[PDB]
Amino acid sequence: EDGYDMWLRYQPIADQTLLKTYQKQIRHLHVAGDSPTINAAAAELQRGLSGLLNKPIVARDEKLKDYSLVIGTPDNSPLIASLNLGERLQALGAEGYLLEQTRINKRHVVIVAANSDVGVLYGSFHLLRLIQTQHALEKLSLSSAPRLQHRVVNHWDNLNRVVERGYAGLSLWDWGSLPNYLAPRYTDYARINASLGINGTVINNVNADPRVLSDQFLQKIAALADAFRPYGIKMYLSINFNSPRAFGDVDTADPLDPRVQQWWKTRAQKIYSYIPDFGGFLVKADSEGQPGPQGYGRDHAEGANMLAAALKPFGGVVFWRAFVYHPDIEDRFRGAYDEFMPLDGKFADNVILQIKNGPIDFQPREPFSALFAGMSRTNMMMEFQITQEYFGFATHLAYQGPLFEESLKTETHARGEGSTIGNILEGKVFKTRHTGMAGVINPGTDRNWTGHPFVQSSWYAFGRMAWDHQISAATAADEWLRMTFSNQPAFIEPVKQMMLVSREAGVNYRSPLGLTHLYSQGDHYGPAPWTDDLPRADWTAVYYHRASKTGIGFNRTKTGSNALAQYPEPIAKAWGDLNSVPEDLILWFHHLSWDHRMQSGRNLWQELVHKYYQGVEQVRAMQRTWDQQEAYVDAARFAQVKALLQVQEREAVRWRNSCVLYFQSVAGRPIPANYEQPEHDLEYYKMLARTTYVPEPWHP
Amino acid sequence: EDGYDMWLRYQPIADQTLLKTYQKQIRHLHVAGDSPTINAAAAELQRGLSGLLNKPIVARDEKLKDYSLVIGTPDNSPLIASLNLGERLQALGAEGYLLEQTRINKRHVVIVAANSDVGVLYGSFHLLRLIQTQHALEKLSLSSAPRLQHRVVNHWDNLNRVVERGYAGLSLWDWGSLPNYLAPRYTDYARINASLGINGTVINNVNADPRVLSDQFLQKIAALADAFRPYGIKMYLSINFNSPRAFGDVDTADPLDPRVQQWWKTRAQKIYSYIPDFGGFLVKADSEGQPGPQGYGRDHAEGANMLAAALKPFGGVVFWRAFVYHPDIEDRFRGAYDEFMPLDGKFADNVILQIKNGPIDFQPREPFSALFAGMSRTNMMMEFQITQEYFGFATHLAYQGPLFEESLKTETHARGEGSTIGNILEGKVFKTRHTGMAGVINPGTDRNWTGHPFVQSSWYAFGRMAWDHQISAATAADEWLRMTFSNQPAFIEPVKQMMLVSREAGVNYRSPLGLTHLYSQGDHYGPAPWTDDLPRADWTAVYYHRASKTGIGFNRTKTGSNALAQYPEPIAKAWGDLNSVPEDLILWFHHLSWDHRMQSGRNLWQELVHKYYQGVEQVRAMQRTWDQQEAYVDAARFAQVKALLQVQEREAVRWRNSCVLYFQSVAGRPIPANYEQPEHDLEYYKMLARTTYVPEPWHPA
């Protein structure tokens, strides 16, 4: 087990009694269709069922045999059509499916039925997943349809193949051999994502390279799109807003200039000539030095709509990112909301605003982005981070399922109770239909795709939750563990719990209690809570914590930056009152004296120290848990995860010591005597922050 | 087949009659020894014999059974000791071995015998290679010993894991998880190299990062050294000469300053505390902006000997590179020789001067470095390039065996006939202390290690030739093809010939007839023969070709730069006379009229055009040959190679068109009508040279 198969490990079912039951139920595979998508589904079931059932199961179009798996749509499978499923199939829409044990002409069958070929593909992966996770097929009757339209992955890949915030190898896209070489890995990539129902990929960096739009690269990109197409995955590209200028075709990129409008229209025509089902564009504009409409004195709707008009005739959409923040505003927290709220309703219907979970930048815990509860006439989609930019690159174990679930189940009170982020994303709160979730996965050429084996779990949870935003972190972990490692209950339970606590451990040894943005700049690998004196104050650490001798925290109430007024009144009320604000967010909104007493009975200084030490203890406990699993895991992945956890414990100690000593130097309070005192001083940790190997190929 | 096993593919022998013979001969595996190295040999034989013979063969220390493979030294194997092999075995030295079908206590056996445990490991790999290449074991009686002492690989790896002139992925060394995580791939890397007898590795870039010497990194590096040790591979590091300054410990790096001398002594003590058998240092100094003794007004012997003194108490060596050339000399070709000859005899005995094959920079064909025939009182070693910096990155097929053989068999006449480069390296010409060969391999994390499958063949040939410098490119290709793809004769023959022509094809479409250095600067991906106006003239293209309306070539005879006078007289004579100079080197030494008539009957302009067009035709023929092999190769590697050959053909056309049109613009002569006229004009190719995606993660400064 080198991890190349990820969670699609088609190994013989270990439970011998259960295996016999599956072998009795699925003796044949019946597939009448022959479209590329159905062929992909048939190929997956043939390899999957053959591996899991430990016998050759070959896809055939022959007279129906007893105990068959039968797949198709009413349009390509007369057997499925003969069942007259009607309304039951109608509720499934364009991507849903039905899995059911039933009878066709007295033959025992299990059907994978859908309206479309892609629905059949998704249903086929779910059928395999039921077997992978040792679920019974007897009396099976279930249907599912995705809750979000655009379920996409994002890759911050540069064309030189270095990945920005990439800890898993070089970019998968081998430009030097494209379009000529159709590497099997491109198909495996499609299989991995299709297994989760992901239907779109943005292959290139948001810090966008205009070359992706050149003929040379569109031909290369078309080969990738061709490989992804049978798996239902549309191709998307990040664009550079100054492309008309970069190509030397127009002397401006102003979206109101007709020559610019025309340049994009012609470029869209060129794209669709190579990729007739091209999805559209991802846009990072007027942010962190990336060009945009504001560079020409135009607004974000003017820029987005210009691109959207170029795509409209071809059915393309614009994912316009809301990650924008000017350095001269009072409070970066307020930035995106103040930029986009005035534009609510001004965007075309093929524009979707892509918004990070929180208003800062993927920090270990952030409150929900106020834009989600404020934009009522604009399509929106979520952007989550999977790659561990802020959770320890490829050496820390940090399952992100809990972060995603926490976000999705957050009640916003935007329009009564039930205004959860998930419900907003689904479109039910504000009544929009163009919906989605994007996940910044940044995998690479490492054999296991993600570097750290457990980053696979985060990619997994993300795709499951993009399909159904109410799926819990626990449910996704249970499936992933079964698929990736073992179905042994004695293994599943402790490892699931280890996964579930890992996110919180990552918060605790870095920045608990509402602290944030304490990382070394600009690499983000280790601690640097002392960081000050950068060209922009909002890229420093002290800007966020505002620690002094008397207190800590950032006042975002009415008496401070009043960012709380950007939220619905029930949220502003709950978070603005010290009696009701969650302690896990408190320092985002309140500047508190070090003597403030917390729910635990500790004062704030004591609670801060307790949290930092708790995070290290949580890592140590993960170490012990993992060591207990040696009998259930292959020796190679066991040894790898054991080793990485040692690296993580060492780094967590460095984080803890650096931060506790830093805040001690500012507060002037002792570390309570029960704790192991750091043996080195703050100056030593400032030296480790200069000399600690930053393990990433890309650099700021 | 994803190429991860490279040439150690232990799959069942396909010839069923032959398989049965092997199965009859090797029924058991007997190993009495238990040192780490013997254990590694035993594990290799267990997995190798089990795979090749398609039956479980487990290494055991039990009473000898009939039809056993028995391995060991007289010191660790009483069975081998009982044969009283004496002088025959002893003559094979510290790394050699004997493979022999014989009898012990009336049992039929095949022995893998050596004086040392590493000799047993090397012999075990040769035993497996005999089976992998379908050689008979009946009456087997062969011995071998390496002809060079230091058989080393070099990795131009940066600590961020980006590889300089690396076309095969990120650096293998995962610094973020070291030393804690002992990745299996580190052992597989040691197996690959040990299978060729490679006994050293320099893991980091010659453009050296001082951090490798920090305690933090030495701990990491020690884990790698630990993984490599059972396989006989010593660890070496490239050093930055300014390290005492970079560490903030000394305000100078002057090798004559006692504080500097002491810094390195203390540093060596720290290294050896982590890695007790550390091999030593590779040094790129006073070259291309890298620091060195000349920065302190000292010479390269003063610098090298300072480092060598630090290592001497621990048995370490300094590989001091001769790749040095100042921008203000009249002819770069003369540089290394003029720098180092005055220092011949001044280097300490644990210093070895590491010299590239040619005096420029790994160009597709270079004449031999004159230093090899001149330095008669200094230890020398060869440096060859495997990574295809100048042969097309990871997209062109270019087996380098012929380049290495061409070099090693070149007669230099240093001390009369028999003064081949190989014999010089072996120590037979000048009678020297330390010998060796280094190969810049630059593999990475790509599943197949080398990107292009065929780069594996170059690494293979390199290690084979480091063991025995008289091994031909053809022999190494025959072995490699058998081990990597197929033993079918109908496959081997045409693919071997394809491999053998591939180097020449790469010369032909880039820079034939003694032309050189026509690449895009500084990435080296594509053609740029017009390159002029760089900060240093010796980094341009025009500096080398000197093309004009009347002629082309660089005068290195007595009437020009007289670089020929740096060679032994018979070479200076042969190359300086137009009647005897090889046409494949001619423009290195002569500036010739475009009307000069070549051996073929063509004038020089016509010959130049013919060679550039021939190179493209040679790639097209490689495509046709490869297509004919579909039945013999697995579908995945077949498809990959087919596709890469398409990329190569397209790029070779770009090269051809760019260079022919460029030289045409200068000569003002027509491309003969028999040749297909380029798809576009010279200005268009000057545009493709700005627009053509450079497929490498690393970029020049």
Ligand SMILES: O=C(O)[C@H]1O[C@@H](O)[C@H](O)[C@@H](O)[C@@H]1O
């Ligand atoms: O989302 C973004 O555009 C940016 O997000 C930040 O988290 C990363 O540090 C930066 O590399 C990205 O370009």
Ligand SMILES: O=C(O)[C@H]1O[C@@H](O)[C@H](O)[C@@H](O)[C@@H]1O
């Ligand atoms: O040998 C060397 O030091 C140099 O060789 C040249 O061929 C390479 O362009 C350069 O990247 C190396 O550093």
Ligand SMILES: [Co+2]
């Ligand atoms: Co893994």
Ligand SMILES: [Co+2]
């Ligand atoms: Co980059």
Ligand SMILES: [Co+2]
């Ligand atoms: Co735990």
Ligand SMILES: [Co+2]
């Ligand atoms: Co206190």
Ligand SMILES: [Co+2]
């Ligand atoms: Co290969």
Ligand SMILES: [Co+2]
């Ligand atoms: Co670099």
Ligand SMILES: [Co+2]
């Ligand atoms: Co050929």
Ligand SMILES: [Co+2]
């Ligand atoms: Co002519």
